[PDB]
Structure 1
Amino acid sequence: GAMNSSNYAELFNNDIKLFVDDTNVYRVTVHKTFEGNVATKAINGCIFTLNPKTGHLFLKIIHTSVWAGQKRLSQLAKWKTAEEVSALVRSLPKEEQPKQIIVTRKAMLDPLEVHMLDFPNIAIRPTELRLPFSAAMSIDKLSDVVMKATEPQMVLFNIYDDWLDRISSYTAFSRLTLLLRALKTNEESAKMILLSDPTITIKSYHLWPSFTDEQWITIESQMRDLILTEYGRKYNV
């Protein structure tokens, strides 16, 4: 059933599972028309499909052409998400297919369930966690590949870089969700923290800076401070 604080270690066991976040699939700018009405203009989006054990990210880029001539786009976006996740599973070898798919928003449950009806043994689950995966478009290299796409495209990443060589999946996921939570609460401050010291760089094949273990502790501390703060700045405490 639902995924929450009490069954958190299940993410890092040896049953293949994927998180699916659809927040960034349908993205628009809202603007005024010459007549003074309001209109939207879509921009490229993405499905964020993540193996939390291995860090493998299946980033399906959603090009704006997929919305052309369609109605009720926020509803269509959930069904397009489920179509694409469905197609991804069907493309994987049997032994790589997930045993569970956890959706970050409950409105994805019925679309994904209907699309996966022939995979009766793959469990589709909601979660009670408020995960910060919407902030994935605050990672510069992910944002860059989404905005540059001129056609539908799947791009594969490891969102943990090489961290699993030094730390466990549990710790890597905790670091990821802390980074994304910070980027979501105050993007400018978070990004300042990550790049302030010009001597720490991002490898061409990585998403995040090449911090030593000691520097990650400092970094992680600064992100926690930011989040508690913003929570003061927000609520005044």
Structure 2
Amino acid sequence: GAMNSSNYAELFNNDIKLFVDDTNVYRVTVHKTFEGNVATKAINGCIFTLNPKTGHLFLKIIHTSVWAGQKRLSQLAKWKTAEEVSALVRSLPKEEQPKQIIVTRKAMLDPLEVHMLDFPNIAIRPTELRLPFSAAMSIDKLSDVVMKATEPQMVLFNIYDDWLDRISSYTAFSRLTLLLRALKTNEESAKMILLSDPTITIKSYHLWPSFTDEQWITIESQMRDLILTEYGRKYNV
């Protein structure tokens, strides 16, 4: 059934699973027209498909051409997402296919279930967790590949860099969701925290800076402070 805080450790067991987040699939800017009407302009999007145990991220770039001449784009985007996740599963060797796919938004359940009819033993589940995967486009290297794309493309990343050499998956996921929540809540301040110190760099082959164990503790504290700070600003507390 649904995935929540009671079964949170299930994310890090040895059953292959993927999170699918469709927030950034259909992305638009809204603007006035010459006649004073309003029009949307789509920009490139992405499906965020993540293995929370290993950090493997399957980033399918959704190029604006897929919307050309299509109607009801917000509805179509869910079905396109499900089509692409199903195609990914079919592309994976049997021993790599997930046993569960957890969608971050309940409107993805029926599209994904219908596209995965051929896989009756893959469970399609919602979650009660509020996950900040919409902020993936605040990770500079992910945003850059999406916006530079001129055609549909799949790009593979490890969203944990090399952290699993030193920490468990549970801790890596907790660090990831804290970083993404902070970038979602105050992007400018989060990036300031992550880069403020020029002597800590992002390796060419990484997404995040090369912090020591002690520096990650400091960074995580500053991210928690940011989130609390913004909550106080928001609610006047």
* TM-score class, shorter: over 0.9
Please give the per-residue CA displacement for 1:74-121, whole angstroms capped at 9, x wherever unaligned. 000000000000000000000000000000000000000000001000
Report the TM-score, using the length of structure 1 for normalisation. Answer: 1.00
Separation in 1, partners of 2:118, 2:84 = 15
CA RMSD of aligned residues (A): 0.2
Q: How far is the alpha carbon of 1:40 from its aligned partner?
A: 0.1
Separation in 1, partners of 2:182, 2:176 = 10
Separation in 1, partners of 2:236, 2:137 = 28
Separation in 1, partners of 2:107, 2:115 = 14
Q: How far is the alpha carbon of 1:212 from its aligned partner?
A: 0.3
Separation in 1, partners of 2:233, 2:187 = 14
Please give the per-residue CA displacement for 1:118-172, whole angstroms capped at 9, x wherever unaligned. 1000000000000000000000000000000000000000000000000000000
Separation in 1, partners of 2:2, 2:236 = 33
Please give the per-residue CA displacement for 1:46-86, whole angstroms capped at 9, x wherever unaligned. 00000000000000000000000000000000000000000
Question: SS of 1:209's equivalent?
Answer: coil
Unaligned runs of 5+ residues in structure 2 are none
Q: How far is the alpha carbon of 1:33 from its aligned partner?
A: 0.3
Partner of 1:113: 113
Please give the per-residue CA displacement for 1:158-207, whole angstroms capped at 9, x wherever unaligned. 00000000000000000000000000000000000000000000000000
Q: How far is the alpha carbon of 1:39 from its aligned partner?
A: 0.1
Please give the per-residue CA displacement for 1:199-221, whole angstroms capped at 9, x wherever unaligned. 00000000000000000000000
Unaligned runs of 5+ residues in structure 1 are none
Separation in 2, partners of 1:127, 1:203 = 33
Separation in 2, partners of 1:167, 1:141 = 23
Question: SS of 1:28's equivalent?
Answer: strand
Q: Which runs of 4+ in 1 moved over 2 A?
A: none
Question: SS of 1:6's equivalent?
Answer: coil
Please give the per-residue CA displacement for 1:11-64, whole angstroms capped at 9, x wherever unaligned. 000000000000000000000000000000000000000000000000000000
Separation in 2, partners of 1:123, 1:5 = 19
Separation in 1, partners of 2:122, 2:198 = 46
Separation in 1, partners of 2:40, 2:81 = 20
Alignment of 1:53-68 (within 5 A): 53-68=53-68
Q: How far is the alpha carbon of 1:227 from its aligned partner?
A: 0.3
